[PDB]
Tab-separated table of C-alpha atoms and ligand atoms in Angstrom:
chain	number	residue	atom	x	y	z
B	1	UNK	CA	0.788	-39.171	73.712
B	2	UNK	CA	-0.191	-39.889	77.349
B	3	UNK	CA	0.055	-43.710	77.281
B	4	UNK	CA	2.970	-45.696	78.824
B	5	UNK	CA	3.413	-49.285	77.713
B	6	UNK	CA	5.424	-51.323	80.227
B	7	UNK	CA	6.379	-54.874	79.498
B	8	UNK	CA	6.463	-57.417	82.355
B	9	UNK	CA	6.949	-61.225	82.797
B	10	UNK	CA	6.157	-62.097	86.416
B	11	UNK	CA	2.665	-61.859	87.954
B	12	UNK	CA	4.386	-59.976	90.832
B	13	UNK	CA	5.615	-57.328	88.330
B	14	UNK	CA	2.200	-57.018	86.796
B	15	UNK	CA	0.675	-56.582	90.286
B	16	UNK	CA	3.228	-53.876	91.222
B	17	UNK	CA	2.514	-52.092	87.923
B	18	UNK	CA	-1.252	-52.221	88.577
B	19	UNK	CA	-0.647	-50.142	91.730
B	20	UNK	CA	1.455	-47.732	89.718
B	21	UNK	CA	-1.293	-47.589	87.034
B	22	UNK	CA	-3.704	-46.215	89.659
B	23	UNK	CA	-1.344	-43.405	90.570
B	24	UNK	CA	-0.340	-42.562	86.981
B	25	UNK	CA	-4.040	-42.218	85.994
B	26	UNK	CA	-4.370	-39.397	88.536
B	27	UNK	CA	-1.549	-37.573	86.672
B	28	UNK	CA	-3.332	-37.991	83.292
B	29	UNK	CA	-1.316	-41.054	82.147
B	30	UNK	CA	-2.535	-44.478	81.120
B	31	UNK	CA	-0.153	-47.341	81.839
B	32	UNK	CA	-0.691	-50.319	79.508
B	33	UNK	CA	0.772	-53.484	80.972
B	34	UNK	CA	2.192	-55.804	78.266
B	35	UNK	CA	2.485	-59.328	79.620
B	36	UNK	CA	5.190	-61.625	78.158
B	37	UNK	CA	6.242	-65.187	78.967
B	38	UNK	CA	9.973	-65.340	78.209
B	39	UNK	CA	13.045	-63.373	79.189
B	40	UNK	CA	13.740	-61.820	75.755
B	41	UNK	CA	10.368	-60.447	74.788
B	42	UNK	CA	10.306	-57.566	77.255
B	43	UNK	CA	13.695	-56.317	75.987
B	44	UNK	CA	12.798	-56.799	72.304
B	45	UNK	CA	9.676	-54.740	72.952
B	46	UNK	CA	11.562	-51.773	74.410
B	47	UNK	CA	14.332	-52.072	71.794
B	48	UNK	CA	11.782	-51.818	68.991
B	49	UNK	CA	9.649	-49.041	70.525
B	50	UNK	CA	6.818	-51.624	70.988
B	51	UNK	CA	6.958	-50.748	74.734
B	52	UNK	CA	8.150	-47.576	76.498
B	53	UNK	CA	9.740	-49.462	79.379
B	54	UNK	CA	9.980	-52.783	81.068
B	55	UNK	CA	9.981	-54.020	84.647
B	56	UNK	CA	11.428	-57.492	84.625
B	57	UNK	CA	15.188	-57.653	85.124
B	58	UNK	CA	18.212	-56.363	86.943
B	59	UNK	CA	20.873	-54.227	85.367
B	60	UNK	CA	23.414	-57.097	84.841
B	61	UNK	CA	20.820	-59.062	82.860
B	62	UNK	CA	19.923	-55.989	80.856
B	63	UNK	CA	23.562	-55.358	80.036
B	64	UNK	CA	23.810	-58.871	78.482
B	65	UNK	CA	20.943	-58.051	76.160
B	66	UNK	CA	22.599	-54.731	75.157
B	67	UNK	CA	25.895	-56.444	74.377
B	68	UNK	CA	24.251	-59.166	72.236
B	69	UNK	CA	21.888	-56.885	70.346
B	70	UNK	CA	23.995	-53.745	70.272
B	71	UNK	CA	21.055	-52.154	71.960
B	72	UNK	CA	20.797	-49.063	74.135
B	73	UNK	CA	18.679	-50.009	77.151
B	74	UNK	CA	19.347	-48.217	80.416
B	75	UNK	CA	18.235	-48.865	83.993
B	76	UNK	CA	16.558	-45.827	85.462
B	77	UNK	CA	15.183	-46.827	88.890
B	78	UNK	CA	15.757	-49.789	91.189
B	79	UNK	CA	12.538	-51.082	92.706
B	80	UNK	CA	13.377	-54.018	94.961
B	81	UNK	CA	16.057	-56.531	95.763
B	82	UNK	CA	16.354	-59.875	97.472
B	83	UNK	CA	19.093	-62.015	99.059
B	84	UNK	CA	20.623	-64.974	97.313
B	85	UNK	CA	22.008	-67.577	99.708
B	86	UNK	CA	23.295	-71.080	100.169
B	87	UNK	CA	21.312	-73.765	102.008
B	88	UNK	CA	22.542	-77.124	103.358
B	89	UNK	CA	20.324	-79.931	104.509
B	90	UNK	CA	23.140	-81.680	106.480
B	91	UNK	CA	25.777	-79.117	107.336
B	92	UNK	CA	25.610	-76.175	109.742
B	93	UNK	CA	28.132	-73.955	108.058
B	94	UNK	CA	30.362	-73.824	105.026
B	95	UNK	CA	33.551	-74.761	106.927
B	96	UNK	CA	32.023	-78.204	107.562
B	97	UNK	CA	31.534	-79.093	103.899
B	98	UNK	CA	33.030	-82.463	103.002
B	99	UNK	CA	36.021	-82.813	100.699
B	100	UNK	CA	34.890	-83.192	97.087
B	101	UNK	CA	31.456	-81.846	98.020
B	102	UNK	CA	29.051	-81.155	95.251
B	103	UNK	CA	27.613	-77.667	95.386
B	104	UNK	CA	24.547	-76.659	93.340
B	105	UNK	CA	24.711	-73.354	91.493
B	106	UNK	CA	22.535	-71.786	88.782
B	107	UNK	CA	23.191	-72.885	85.246
B	108	UNK	CA	22.793	-69.511	83.522
B	109	UNK	CA	25.802	-67.155	83.392
B	110	UNK	CA	24.357	-64.164	85.229
B	111	UNK	CA	23.168	-66.226	88.180
B	112	UNK	CA	26.250	-68.387	88.174
B	113	UNK	CA	28.341	-65.234	88.710
B	114	UNK	CA	26.026	-64.069	91.462
B	115	UNK	CA	26.316	-67.384	93.320
B	116	UNK	CA	30.090	-67.632	92.869
B	117	UNK	CA	30.548	-64.047	94.139
B	118	UNK	CA	28.938	-65.115	97.435
B	119	UNK	CA	31.313	-68.070	97.783
B	120	UNK	CA	34.279	-65.833	96.931
B	121	UNK	CA	33.191	-63.230	99.520
B	122	UNK	CA	32.960	-65.937	102.165
B	123	UNK	CA	36.272	-67.650	101.443
B	124	UNK	CA	34.772	-70.947	100.243
B	125	UNK	CA	36.656	-70.678	96.968
B	126	UNK	CA	38.741	-67.943	95.438
B	127	UNK	CA	37.961	-66.462	92.066
B	128	UNK	CA	40.517	-64.986	89.697
B	129	UNK	CA	41.400	-61.412	90.545
B	130	UNK	CA	38.935	-58.864	89.347
B	131	UNK	CA	36.140	-61.026	87.926
B	132	UNK	CA	33.707	-59.589	90.513
B	133	UNK	CA	30.105	-60.607	89.705
B	134	UNK	CA	31.095	-62.169	86.326
B	135	UNK	CA	32.909	-65.228	87.586
B	136	UNK	CA	32.368	-68.643	86.115
B	137	UNK	CA	33.474	-71.967	87.417
B	138	UNK	CA	36.475	-71.785	85.070
B	139	UNK	CA	37.611	-68.692	87.044
B	140	UNK	CA	38.038	-70.626	90.269
B	141	UNK	CA	41.698	-70.355	91.225
B	142	UNK	CA	41.587	-71.827	94.723
B	143	UNK	CA	39.322	-74.678	95.701
B	144	UNK	CA	40.687	-76.127	98.975
B	145	UNK	CA	37.840	-78.679	99.414
B	146	UNK	CA	37.874	-79.651	95.738
B	147	UNK	CA	34.200	-78.769	95.368
B	148	UNK	CA	32.434	-79.849	92.208
B	149	UNK	CA	30.031	-77.245	90.991
B	150	UNK	CA	26.818	-78.817	89.754
B	151	UNK	CA	25.145	-76.650	87.186
B	152	UNK	CA	21.442	-76.765	87.928
B	153	UNK	CA	18.511	-74.922	86.430
B	154	UNK	CA	17.068	-72.215	88.620
B	155	UNK	CA	13.794	-74.126	88.716
B	156	UNK	CA	15.486	-77.253	90.062
B	157	UNK	CA	17.582	-75.659	92.815
B	158	UNK	CA	14.969	-76.110	95.574
B	159	UNK	CA	14.689	-79.857	94.767
B	160	UNK	CA	18.474	-80.179	94.746
B	161	UNK	CA	18.357	-79.151	98.490
B	162	UNK	CA	17.000	-82.631	99.224
B	163	UNK	CA	19.287	-84.471	96.859
B	164	UNK	CA	21.489	-86.868	98.836
B	165	UNK	CA	24.756	-86.150	97.040
B	166	UNK	CA	24.377	-82.317	96.972
B	167	UNK	CA	26.050	-80.858	100.071
B	168	UNK	CA	24.654	-77.331	99.574
B	169	UNK	CA	22.701	-75.360	97.027
B	170	UNK	CA	22.176	-71.761	96.027
B	171	UNK	CA	18.584	-70.537	96.128
B	172	UNK	CA	16.420	-67.425	96.050
B	173	UNK	CA	13.830	-66.648	98.653
B	174	UNK	CA	10.910	-67.092	96.205
B	175	UNK	CA	11.825	-70.761	95.744
B	176	UNK	CA	12.262	-71.656	99.448
B	177	UNK	CA	8.562	-72.227	100.305
B	178	UNK	CA	8.037	-75.879	99.167
B	179	UNK	CA	11.346	-76.895	100.769
B	180	UNK	CA	10.215	-75.469	104.147
B	181	UNK	CA	12.893	-72.716	104.435
B	182	UNK	CA	13.506	-68.977	104.870
B	183	UNK	CA	16.656	-66.884	104.435
B	184	UNK	CA	17.046	-67.455	108.203
B	185	UNK	CA	18.122	-71.017	107.298
B	186	UNK	CA	20.846	-69.851	104.884
B	187	UNK	CA	24.357	-70.958	105.790
B	188	UNK	CA	25.748	-68.207	103.559
B	189	UNK	CA	23.708	-65.118	102.769
B	190	UNK	CA	24.428	-62.509	100.147
B	191	UNK	CA	25.381	-59.139	101.588
B	192	UNK	CA	22.928	-56.253	101.057
B	193	UNK	CA	25.208	-54.295	98.737
B	194	UNK	CA	25.557	-57.294	96.430
B	195	UNK	CA	21.760	-57.864	96.473
B	196	UNK	CA	21.283	-54.181	95.501
B	197	UNK	CA	23.596	-54.773	92.583
B	198	UNK	CA	20.896	-57.165	91.316
B	199	UNK	CA	17.904	-54.997	92.139
B	200	UNK	CA	15.019	-55.291	89.715
B	201	UNK	CA	14.945	-52.109	87.622
B	202	UNK	CA	12.719	-49.962	85.516
B	203	UNK	CA	14.344	-50.089	82.098
B	204	UNK	CA	13.939	-47.929	78.983
B	205	UNK	CA	15.853	-46.770	75.926
B	206	UNK	CA	18.674	-44.319	76.563
B	207	UNK	CA	17.010	-41.705	74.401
B	208	UNK	CA	13.816	-41.918	76.483
B	209	UNK	CA	15.397	-41.867	79.948
B	210	UNK	CA	14.585	-38.180	80.584
B	211	UNK	CA	11.141	-38.172	78.980
B	212	UNK	CA	7.973	-37.107	80.765
B	213	UNK	CA	6.449	-40.581	80.362
B	214	UNK	CA	9.419	-42.244	82.157
B	215	UNK	CA	9.362	-39.553	84.840
B	216	UNK	CA	5.700	-40.258	85.591
B	217	UNK	CA	6.359	-44.040	85.577
B	218	UNK	CA	9.278	-43.722	88.051
B	219	UNK	CA	7.269	-41.505	90.336
B	220	UNK	CA	4.248	-43.824	90.345
B	221	UNK	CA	6.412	-46.884	91.148
B	222	UNK	CA	8.183	-45.312	94.131
B	223	UNK	CA	5.379	-44.399	96.505
B	224	UNK	CA	4.639	-45.639	100.010
B	225	UNK	CA	1.790	-47.763	98.638
B	226	UNK	CA	4.203	-49.586	96.274
B	227	UNK	CA	6.818	-50.124	98.970
B	228	UNK	CA	4.205	-51.583	101.331
B	229	UNK	CA	2.888	-53.889	98.575
B	230	UNK	CA	6.379	-55.085	97.712
B	231	UNK	CA	7.007	-56.088	101.308
B	232	UNK	CA	3.537	-57.528	102.031
B	233	UNK	CA	3.087	-59.404	98.762
B	234	UNK	CA	6.529	-61.031	99.049
B	235	UNK	CA	6.139	-61.915	102.701
B	236	UNK	CA	9.201	-59.858	103.563
B	237	UNK	CA	11.502	-61.447	100.932
B	238	UNK	CA	11.592	-58.429	98.531
B	239	UNK	CA	13.077	-55.287	100.011
B	240	UNK	CA	12.174	-51.939	98.418
B	241	UNK	CA	15.193	-50.264	96.812
B	242	UNK	CA	13.764	-46.779	97.495
D	1	UNK	CA	31.796	-102.154	83.688
D	2	UNK	CA	29.105	-103.073	81.118
D	3	UNK	CA	26.615	-100.254	81.836
D	4	UNK	CA	26.163	-97.169	79.579
D	5	UNK	CA	24.417	-94.161	81.067
D	6	UNK	CA	22.985	-91.865	78.386
D	7	UNK	CA	21.378	-88.605	79.304
D	8	UNK	CA	18.364	-87.370	77.297
D	9	UNK	CA	15.786	-84.495	77.463
D	10	UNK	CA	13.101	-85.175	74.854
D	11	UNK	CA	10.622	-88.078	75.049
D	12	UNK	CA	11.590	-88.761	71.391
D	13	UNK	CA	15.249	-89.228	72.473
D	14	UNK	CA	14.252	-91.507	75.288
D	15	UNK	CA	12.125	-93.573	72.858
D	16	UNK	CA	15.009	-93.853	70.344
D	17	UNK	CA	17.344	-94.913	73.173
D	18	UNK	CA	14.855	-97.575	74.334
D	19	UNK	CA	15.214	-99.225	70.902
D	20	UNK	CA	18.973	-99.019	71.212
D	21	UNK	CA	18.753	-100.486	74.757
D	22	UNK	CA	17.175	-103.641	73.291
D	23	UNK	CA	20.034	-104.120	70.864
D	24	UNK	CA	22.805	-103.279	73.357
D	25	UNK	CA	21.426	-105.890	75.819
D	26	UNK	CA	22.053	-108.579	73.190
D	27	UNK	CA	25.740	-107.497	73.165
D	28	UNK	CA	25.983	-107.767	76.992
D	29	UNK	CA	25.496	-104.022	77.693
D	30	UNK	CA	22.899	-102.301	79.829
D	31	UNK	CA	21.912	-98.815	78.705
D	32	UNK	CA	20.596	-96.665	81.574
D	33	UNK	CA	18.548	-93.760	80.279
D	34	UNK	CA	18.952	-90.627	82.456
D	35	UNK	CA	16.052	-88.266	81.858
D	36	UNK	CA	16.625	-84.506	82.369
D	37	UNK	CA	14.369	-81.481	81.909
D	38	UNK	CA	16.689	-78.628	80.911
D	39	UNK	CA	19.327	-78.046	78.273
D	40	UNK	CA	22.350	-77.940	80.627
D	41	UNK	CA	21.859	-81.037	82.716
D	42	UNK	CA	22.713	-83.565	80.019
D	43	UNK	CA	26.047	-81.812	79.335
D	44	UNK	CA	26.877	-81.361	83.038
D	45	UNK	CA	26.273	-85.082	83.471
D	46	UNK	CA	28.730	-86.111	80.752
D	47	UNK	CA	31.252	-83.450	81.832
D	48	UNK	CA	31.273	-84.832	85.370
D	49	UNK	CA	31.320	-88.540	84.441
D	50	UNK	CA	27.734	-88.822	85.841
D	51	UNK	CA	26.726	-90.086	82.347
D	52	UNK	CA	28.800	-91.800	79.635
D	53	UNK	CA	27.072	-89.975	76.794
D	54	UNK	CA	24.133	-87.859	75.889
D	55	UNK	CA	21.653	-87.729	73.030
D	56	UNK	CA	20.056	-84.324	73.095
D	57	UNK	CA	21.818	-81.698	70.992
D	58	UNK	CA	23.580	-80.851	67.784
D	59	UNK	CA	27.264	-80.156	67.518
D	60	UNK	CA	26.924	-76.303	67.405
D	61	UNK	CA	25.006	-76.352	70.696
D	62	UNK	CA	27.548	-78.690	72.222
D	63	UNK	CA	30.390	-76.429	71.161
D	64	UNK	CA	28.788	-73.520	73.108
D	65	UNK	CA	28.809	-75.611	76.256
D	66	UNK	CA	32.496	-76.545	75.708
D	67	UNK	CA	33.497	-72.915	75.240
D	68	UNK	CA	31.655	-71.749	78.394
D	69	UNK	CA	32.778	-74.583	80.643
D	70	UNK	CA	36.171	-75.268	79.120
D	71	UNK	CA	34.872	-78.752	78.663
D	72	UNK	CA	35.894	-81.501	76.266
D	73	UNK	CA	32.690	-82.931	74.795
D	74	UNK	CA	32.832	-84.361	71.296
D	75	UNK	CA	30.142	-85.410	68.822
D	76	UNK	CA	30.654	-88.969	67.691
D	77	UNK	CA	27.640	-89.927	65.538
D	78	UNK	CA	24.861	-87.950	63.879
D	79	UNK	CA	21.478	-89.603	64.278
D	80	UNK	CA	18.884	-87.450	62.533
D	81	UNK	CA	18.269	-84.015	61.131
D	82	UNK	CA	15.336	-81.848	60.187
D	83	UNK	CA	14.659	-78.788	58.003
D	84	UNK	CA	14.245	-75.331	59.425
D	85	UNK	CA	12.124	-73.056	57.243
D	86	UNK	CA	10.198	-69.839	56.968
D	87	UNK	CA	6.391	-69.738	56.810
D	88	UNK	CA	4.131	-66.839	55.758
D	89	UNK	CA	0.420	-66.678	56.329
D	90	UNK	CA	-0.116	-63.911	53.696
D	91	UNK	CA	2.752	-64.017	51.242
D	92	UNK	CA	3.616	-66.648	48.634
D	93	UNK	CA	7.329	-66.085	48.507
D	94	UNK	CA	10.037	-64.013	50.106
D	95	UNK	CA	10.305	-61.532	47.201
D	96	UNK	CA	6.771	-60.349	48.035
D	97	UNK	CA	7.536	-59.336	51.618
D	98	UNK	CA	6.434	-55.791	52.401
D	99	UNK	CA	8.902	-53.004	53.119
D	100	UNK	CA	9.641	-52.800	56.845
D	101	UNK	CA	8.238	-56.305	57.316
D	102	UNK	CA	8.629	-57.895	60.670
D	103	UNK	CA	10.191	-61.327	60.499
D	104	UNK	CA	10.106	-63.742	63.460
D	105	UNK	CA	13.332	-65.535	64.323
D	106	UNK	CA	14.434	-67.581	67.346
D	107	UNK	CA	15.635	-65.653	70.342
D	108	UNK	CA	18.540	-67.908	71.338
D	109	UNK	CA	21.918	-67.413	69.614
D	110	UNK	CA	22.360	-70.852	68.068
D	111	UNK	CA	18.927	-70.853	66.459
D	112	UNK	CA	19.147	-67.218	65.507
D	113	UNK	CA	22.264	-68.047	63.458
D	114	UNK	CA	20.537	-71.015	61.879
D	115	UNK	CA	17.553	-68.903	60.804
D	116	UNK	CA	19.692	-66.017	59.538
D	117	UNK	CA	21.866	-68.427	57.504
D	118	UNK	CA	18.734	-69.475	55.585
D	119	UNK	CA	17.846	-65.856	54.805
D	120	UNK	CA	21.444	-65.164	53.752
D	121	UNK	CA	21.475	-68.238	51.469
D	122	UNK	CA	18.267	-67.066	49.822
D	123	UNK	CA	19.251	-63.436	49.298
D	124	UNK	CA	16.664	-61.962	51.684
D	125	UNK	CA	19.384	-60.177	53.622
D	126	UNK	CA	23.142	-60.304	53.456
D	127	UNK	CA	25.263	-61.187	56.439
D	128	UNK	CA	28.787	-59.948	57.042
D	129	UNK	CA	31.382	-61.970	55.185
D	130	UNK	CA	32.321	-65.200	56.825
D	131	UNK	CA	29.899	-65.366	59.761
D	132	UNK	CA	28.370	-68.571	58.324
D	133	UNK	CA	26.017	-70.211	60.862
D	134	UNK	CA	27.012	-67.763	63.664
D	135	UNK	CA	25.327	-64.646	62.366
D	136	UNK	CA	23.315	-62.371	64.579
D	137	UNK	CA	21.032	-59.572	63.618
D	138	UNK	CA	23.896	-57.137	64.263
D	139	UNK	CA	25.787	-58.878	61.409
D	140	UNK	CA	23.222	-57.899	58.806
D	141	UNK	CA	25.021	-55.734	56.265
D	142	UNK	CA	22.353	-55.502	53.574
D	143	UNK	CA	18.663	-55.309	54.325
D	144	UNK	CA	16.936	-54.021	51.155
D	145	UNK	CA	13.373	-54.330	52.577
D	146	UNK	CA	14.380	-52.894	55.952
D	147	UNK	CA	13.110	-55.983	57.757
D	148	UNK	CA	12.802	-55.829	61.519
D	149	UNK	CA	13.822	-59.049	63.138
D	150	UNK	CA	11.496	-59.950	65.983
D	151	UNK	CA	13.230	-62.090	68.533
D	152	UNK	CA	10.748	-64.735	69.587
D	153	UNK	CA	11.071	-67.742	71.842
D	154	UNK	CA	11.157	-71.055	70.046
D	155	UNK	CA	7.957	-72.033	71.829
D	156	UNK	CA	6.118	-68.972	70.526
D	157	UNK	CA	7.151	-69.170	66.865
D	158	UNK	CA	4.131	-71.233	65.741
D	159	UNK	CA	1.733	-68.681	67.326
D	160	UNK	CA	3.631	-65.823	65.697
D	161	UNK	CA	2.588	-67.368	62.289
D	162	UNK	CA	-0.922	-66.061	62.969
D	163	UNK	CA	0.145	-62.724	64.360
D	164	UNK	CA	-1.188	-59.939	62.131
D	165	UNK	CA	1.948	-57.799	62.068
D	166	UNK	CA	4.433	-60.692	61.525
D	167	UNK	CA	4.980	-61.160	57.781
D	168	UNK	CA	6.878	-64.463	58.132
D	169	UNK	CA	8.311	-66.666	60.830
D	170	UNK	CA	10.973	-69.312	61.209
D	171	UNK	CA	9.774	-72.674	62.500
D	172	UNK	CA	10.765	-76.309	62.918
D	173	UNK	CA	8.682	-79.171	61.671
D	174	UNK	CA	7.851	-80.402	65.208
D	175	UNK	CA	6.019	-77.143	65.937
D	176	UNK	CA	3.965	-76.970	62.702
D	177	UNK	CA	1.114	-79.322	63.746
D	178	UNK	CA	-1.204	-76.939	65.710
D	179	UNK	CA	-0.788	-74.261	63.027
D	180	UNK	CA	-1.956	-76.713	60.316
D	181	UNK	CA	1.323	-76.807	58.298
D	182	UNK	CA	4.069	-79.047	56.888
D	183	UNK	CA	7.480	-78.211	55.418
D	184	UNK	CA	5.596	-78.307	52.084
D	185	UNK	CA	4.129	-74.919	53.103
D	186	UNK	CA	7.552	-73.342	53.731
D	187	UNK	CA	8.333	-70.319	51.580
D	188	UNK	CA	12.032	-70.799	52.333
D	189	UNK	CA	13.399	-74.188	53.319
D	190	UNK	CA	16.801	-74.957	54.743
D	191	UNK	CA	19.025	-76.909	52.380
D	192	UNK	CA	19.904	-80.498	53.368
D	193	UNK	CA	23.587	-79.794	53.957
D	194	UNK	CA	22.740	-77.017	56.408
D	195	UNK	CA	20.205	-79.273	58.204
D	196	UNK	CA	22.940	-81.949	58.520
D	197	UNK	CA	25.139	-79.342	60.128
D	198	UNK	CA	22.542	-79.315	62.933
D	199	UNK	CA	22.008	-83.057	63.134
D	200	UNK	CA	21.289	-84.371	66.604
D	201	UNK	CA	24.407	-86.194	67.813
D	202	UNK	CA	25.611	-88.797	70.217
D	203	UNK	CA	27.976	-86.890	72.476
D	204	UNK	CA	30.661	-88.032	74.929
D	205	UNK	CA	33.919	-86.883	76.484
D	206	UNK	CA	36.911	-86.740	74.160
D	207	UNK	CA	38.778	-89.263	76.262
D	208	UNK	CA	35.904	-91.757	75.942
D	209	UNK	CA	35.255	-91.393	72.207
D	210	UNK	CA	37.078	-94.629	71.277
D	211	UNK	CA	35.887	-96.705	74.227
D	212	UNK	CA	34.052	-100.004	73.894
D	213	UNK	CA	30.967	-98.587	75.636
D	214	UNK	CA	30.657	-95.736	73.069
D	215	UNK	CA	31.283	-98.174	70.220
D	216	UNK	CA	28.408	-100.387	71.367
D	217	UNK	CA	26.152	-97.317	71.845
D	218	UNK	CA	26.884	-96.006	68.311
D	219	UNK	CA	26.270	-99.393	66.788
D	220	UNK	CA	22.966	-99.897	68.614
D	221	UNK	CA	21.683	-96.445	67.556
D	222	UNK	CA	22.415	-96.899	63.846
D	223	UNK	CA	20.411	-99.958	62.868
D	224	UNK	CA	17.550	-100.325	60.409
D	225	UNK	CA	15.103	-100.565	63.318
D	226	UNK	CA	16.252	-97.153	64.649
D	227	UNK	CA	16.118	-95.507	61.232
D	228	UNK	CA	12.576	-96.795	60.657
D	229	UNK	CA	11.484	-95.564	64.113
D	230	UNK	CA	12.991	-92.138	63.525
D	231	UNK	CA	11.018	-91.735	60.320
D	232	UNK	CA	7.752	-93.302	61.553
D	233	UNK	CA	7.675	-91.661	64.974
D	234	UNK	CA	8.335	-88.203	63.497
D	235	UNK	CA	5.850	-88.602	60.679
D	236	UNK	CA	8.600	-88.065	58.129
D	237	UNK	CA	9.969	-84.837	59.695
D	238	UNK	CA	13.205	-86.371	61.131
D	239	UNK	CA	15.549	-87.804	58.538
D	240	UNK	CA	18.094	-90.419	59.655
D	241	UNK	CA	21.672	-89.150	59.346
D	242	UNK	CA	22.988	-92.685	58.695
M	301	NA	NA1	23.506	-85.623	91.730
M	302	NA	NA1	4.019	-57.959	67.140
M	303	ZN	ZN1	-1.636	-61.144	91.028
M	304	ZN	ZN1	0.299	-38.917	93.952
M	305	ZN	ZN1	27.375	-82.650	87.385
M	306	ZN	ZN1	27.228	-53.030	91.697
M	307	ZN	ZN1	13.439	-43.793	99.289
M	308	ZN	ZN1	7.327	-92.184	74.180
M	309	ZN	ZN1	22.544	-106.756	66.277
M	310	ZN	ZN1	10.212	-56.441	68.563
M	311	ZN	ZN1	28.780	-77.839	58.902
M	312	ZN	ZN1	24.072	-95.333	56.681
């Protein structure tokens, strides 16, 4: 078989895969792009051999699926990353935050940990020893300003920037446009090594990781043409991980 | 203070609370309805004293929030319940399912357990001893037909009914309309005691559960007028739990 079914969720992932599909066809392979509209479907597909791979998540998100489903997905190639950050409409820096400030963070566990790791790295709070990227609010062990962490859906974080009683909010570069911002406006920015931890990955089953199909897929997704697209199409926000 | 802030997500919950708001006003209380658009916000609000109560979830869903946040929410009054069920476009009953059938179940843990409990109760599969309503696919210990469980977003379950390679799918009565069905068409229907386990509840903080505000709220949400609305507005699908 010379067909490679890759499941994706975002239009951006589909568009990246369309570039790869051009290249793979020159090597005798047909990439079929399976489009899905929720964050489980692309993993279900690969788990059940309904897709050969997916391009939709970072490794930490994948590992949550494996643990829940006792599945065997592996990340085989990082493609791009971006910088999480905190944004404050009224304050210049994190030292200025008011006592009992409310701070907006993502409501889902993976992104909560990502946001809290940035605060921990910057001394805003201290997390319990060793929790790393898996911290939750309950792991806060020092909170000098008595910050209240407001758990906010990813989709509502940009709006929370303008909310009067929210001192600062976590956001991703994709969501900064309507609010009039870039990562240049961030008062705390995720360091590059942490962003690479969350790079979007090509994912497949463990047993398939060395197959010819996956080799062709990796090779077609890591060319100059893909790197240039990633940068251009994201307006500089997504950084190629190769 | 004579104001009661109740957070809700669904328009149906808001409409039920508007009836209650009429009654509470006659007892000297003003109910403020806080509308939210995701499944965390209503719990965050009550956790942080931003709302006095919420009306949006069942107790099992609430208990997941408590465990994650080390929070202290309690369910104080069930309001209505409905029957989960399985629906099959091509088969009359569950004994007829083909070998290696694909069966659609909800992709989120709480609803996965609810769906699997129905299969377990009806002998379609057997779950590991004692998992009750918290089963996952990994807890299946007997699977005579070698069913593959397709993990499908709640919003996509009704469509999966018409999917050629899906033998049967779990669905809720709210989602049956476009597909042309009622619970009468169910080939397996959740028993009443299990549906009551998942009754939508009035929820508050433990420390507030005996307060005058919560007493007035419970009383205003459990009248004849509310029961009739629940039944009429749902076209018979929601059954009052009082
Ligand atoms: Na607020
Ligand atoms: Na299918
Ligand atoms: Zn496009
Ligand atoms: Zn080439
Ligand atoms: Zn809050
Ligand atoms: Zn790492
Ligand atoms: Zn490189
Ligand atoms: Zn209405
Ligand atoms: Zn009365
Ligand atoms: Zn599947
Ligand atoms: Zn029960
Ligand atoms: Zn009664």
